[PDB]
């Protein structure tokens, strides 16, 4: 209608290949297979037993086209710290969401401290259901907005500090309007 996608993990061809740090043991690609046997590309991490997690994942460079304000819609699922057996003084039920404004569409290592926190993201009231045949993923849907943006594009980062989290859909868009 008047929404215009700059990124939709769901419609991407082949692996996302986003940058994770650490590269292994932190955030990792996981395909959920839908009814026609086509992967939904997720990122997940569940090191709830180990202390001081600090796992980063960043998208590829995303252009803002003309837009000063963009909307980020995350479809996630958390596992409660209650539900996982075992002791866990550092378990979490949120992740952090950051953005970084850049004119360069090929930065290799962006420092954590150039990143600008948009919000801490928890399972709140809002959800979506996605019918994938054998199951219906009930997921949280959060939406945040950011701006005003001025540089050509930007990067999104997701920080985990000890949650059991599956990021199922990341959509970015602006309103043509």
């Amino acid at each position: 209608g008047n929404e215009v996608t700059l990124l939709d993990s769901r419609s991407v061809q082949g692996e996302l290949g986003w940058i994770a740090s650490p590269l292994e043991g932190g955030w990792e690609e996981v395909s959920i297979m839908d009814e026609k046997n086509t992967p939904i590309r997720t990122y997940q991490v569940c090191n709830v037993m180990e202390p001081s997690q600090n796992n980063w994942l960043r998208t590829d460079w995303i252009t803002r086209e003309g837009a000063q304000r963009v909307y980020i819609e995350i479809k996630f699922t958390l596992r409660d710290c209650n539900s996982l057996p075992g002791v866990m003084g550092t378990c979490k039920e949120t992740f952090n969401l950051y953005y970084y404004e850049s004119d360069n569409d090929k930065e290799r290592f962006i420092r954590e401290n150039q990143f600008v926190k948009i919000d801490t993201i928890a399972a709140d009231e809002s959800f979506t259901q996605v019918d994938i045949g054998d199951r219906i993923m009930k997921l949280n849907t959060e939406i945040r907005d950011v701006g005003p943006l001025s540089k050509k594009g930007f990067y999104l980062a997701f920080q985990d500090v000890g949650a059991c989290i599956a990021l199922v859909s990341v959509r970015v868009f602006y309103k043509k309007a």
């Binding site: 959920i32 997720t42 997940q44 090191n47 596992r79 993923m137 059991c164």
Partner: peptide
């Protein structure tokens, strides 16, 4: 190893 993995449903 992740403690659990979501493949449409959690799975620990």
């Amino acid at each position: 190893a992740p403690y659990c993995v979501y493949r449409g449903s959690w799975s620990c």
